[PDB]
Amino acid sequence: MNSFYSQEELKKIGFLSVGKNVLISKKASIYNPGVISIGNNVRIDDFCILSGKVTIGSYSHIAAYTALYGGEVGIEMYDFANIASRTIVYAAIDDFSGNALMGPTIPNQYKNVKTGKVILKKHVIIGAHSIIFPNVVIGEGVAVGAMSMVKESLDDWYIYVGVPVRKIKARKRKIVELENEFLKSM
C-alpha cells in the first residue's frame, strides 16, 4: 500500500509547522518535532530520520533512508529542493583529527564539534548515497551526483560529483522556467 500518516495523525506529531499535502512515512523517525517545519507538498519516505532543527519548504521529496541531523544550528531546504535515497546531511560532526574525543557518549568539553547551518537552495538535487557535512550552502540549482561527498559551499547552477566533489558541468537552467509554468496552472 503506503505507509504515510493521515493528515489527521500529522497534526498530532507536534511539528513547529506542517503544510498541506504532506506525506510522511510511519517508518521514519522524528526527534524534537517542535523544531522541524515542513511547507506544502513534501514527501518523506521509510527509514528516514529527521533529528533536531530541520526546515523544509514545498515540493520536496526526502527519499528513503535519508538522515537529516539538524542539531541546534539546523538544516534548511528551499522550495523544489530534493534529496535522493540514503543521503546524510549533518549540521554537526565530531573532529576526526585526533585532537578530540568523539560522539554522544562523551561530554562536550572533551570534544571538538564542528557545526554550522546547512542550506540547500532552491532546485538543489542531492544524488543517492551522498553526504553533506556542516556549514555549507549547496547553491541554487546545484546537482550533486550519487555517492558524492560535500565539505564546502557549492557554486550555483553546477553539477558536482565525487569524493570530495568536483564541478563537472553547468546545470541547465530550464527548470526555472518550468517552475513558473507549473506554478501558473496550480
Added chain:
Amino acid sequence: MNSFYSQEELKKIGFLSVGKNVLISKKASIYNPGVISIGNNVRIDDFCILSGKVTIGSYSHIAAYTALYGGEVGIEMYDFANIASRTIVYAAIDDFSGNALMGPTIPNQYKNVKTGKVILKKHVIIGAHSIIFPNVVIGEGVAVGAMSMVKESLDDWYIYVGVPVRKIKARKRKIVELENEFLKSM
C-alpha cells in the same frame, strides 16, 4: 531468532506469486505486492523496500537495506542472482541535467523520467552499497564490487568496480558447474 514472516503471514500479503521456503523480514517494506513474484529459496532482510514491479527467481538473497524500485517497467532477477546490503536498483530515474523538474511531488509533464526494465541475469552478484540505474541489463555471471555505480548494461562473465564501474577482470564460470551439481543433488 529472526524477523521473517510465517508461511501463514506471507500468504496474507497478497503476492502476485510466492514460492516455497521464502524468508521475508517483517521489517522490510513491500509496496504493491500484487505486482511482485518471488520464486523459491529467497531471503529478503530487514529494511529492504520492494516497490512496484519486481520479479525474483529462486536461490536469491536480497540483503538488508536494499531498495528495489520496479515502478512500471519492473526489475527482474534470474535464478542464483544475489544483492548485498544497502543497494538501490532503479527501474525509473529523474533527469538530473536541469532540463526538467524532479520527484514525486511534481506532475509528469514537467518531468523527464528515464525508465526501462532492469535485468539481473543468472549468477549476478551486486556488492554492498551499489547503485544500478534504469534500462540496464546486468549480464550473466557479472560481479559488481562494493560501492559500484552502474549506469549502462554490463557484458557477461566480468568483474566490475568503481563509480561509474569499469571492467577489471573475468569472472570464472566454475559457479556454473556448481549450479548443475547442486541441482542434481536437489
Added chain:
Amino acid sequence: MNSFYSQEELKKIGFLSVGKNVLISKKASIYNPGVISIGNNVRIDDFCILSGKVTIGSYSHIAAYTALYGGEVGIEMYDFANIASRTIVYAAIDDFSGNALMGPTIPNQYKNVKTGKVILKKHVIIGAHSIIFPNVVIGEGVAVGAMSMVKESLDDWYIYVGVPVRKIKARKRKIVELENEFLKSM
C-alpha cells in the same frame, strides 16, 4: 523524543552481557543476543543491525543504519571506538570470483565463505557509509574517512581514505591525554 529501551527492557533481550547507561534503539535489530556483549556508556541508533558475535566495550556510539555481521568469528570493538552512520562491518563474506556459489540460500559445500575476526582497537573511528571486510585489525587510534572501504589491517594512529583505503596522514594523539583527563574526573 528518543526511541531507546528502558534499562528494564534491556535485561529482557538476554545479551551475553550488557553494562550500564546503554541506549539501544527499539528500531535496531539484534540477532542472537546470546553472543553479544556490551560494556557501559554505549549508544546504538535506529536501524542498526547486530547479528551473531559482537563485542562492544565502553564509550561507543554505533550510529544509525550501521550493520555489524559478526557471524561466528566475531567483531570486537575496544573502548572509545566509534562507528558513524550507515557503516557495514563483515566478519564473513562470500567469494566474488566465480569459483563458488553464494549467499545464505545455498549449502556451505558449494560456497567459499571468507571468515576472520574484525577488531577495532581503542579510539578507532570509522566514518559514515564505510565498509570493513573480514579478518581486519583496525589499529588503535585509526580514523577511516567517510565512504571508504577496508580489506586489510590498518596501522595505528593513521588516517586512511578511499576505496580501498590509502594512508593519508598521521592521526593526532592528543586524544590519549584527553581520555586520561576525562577518566580521572570520574
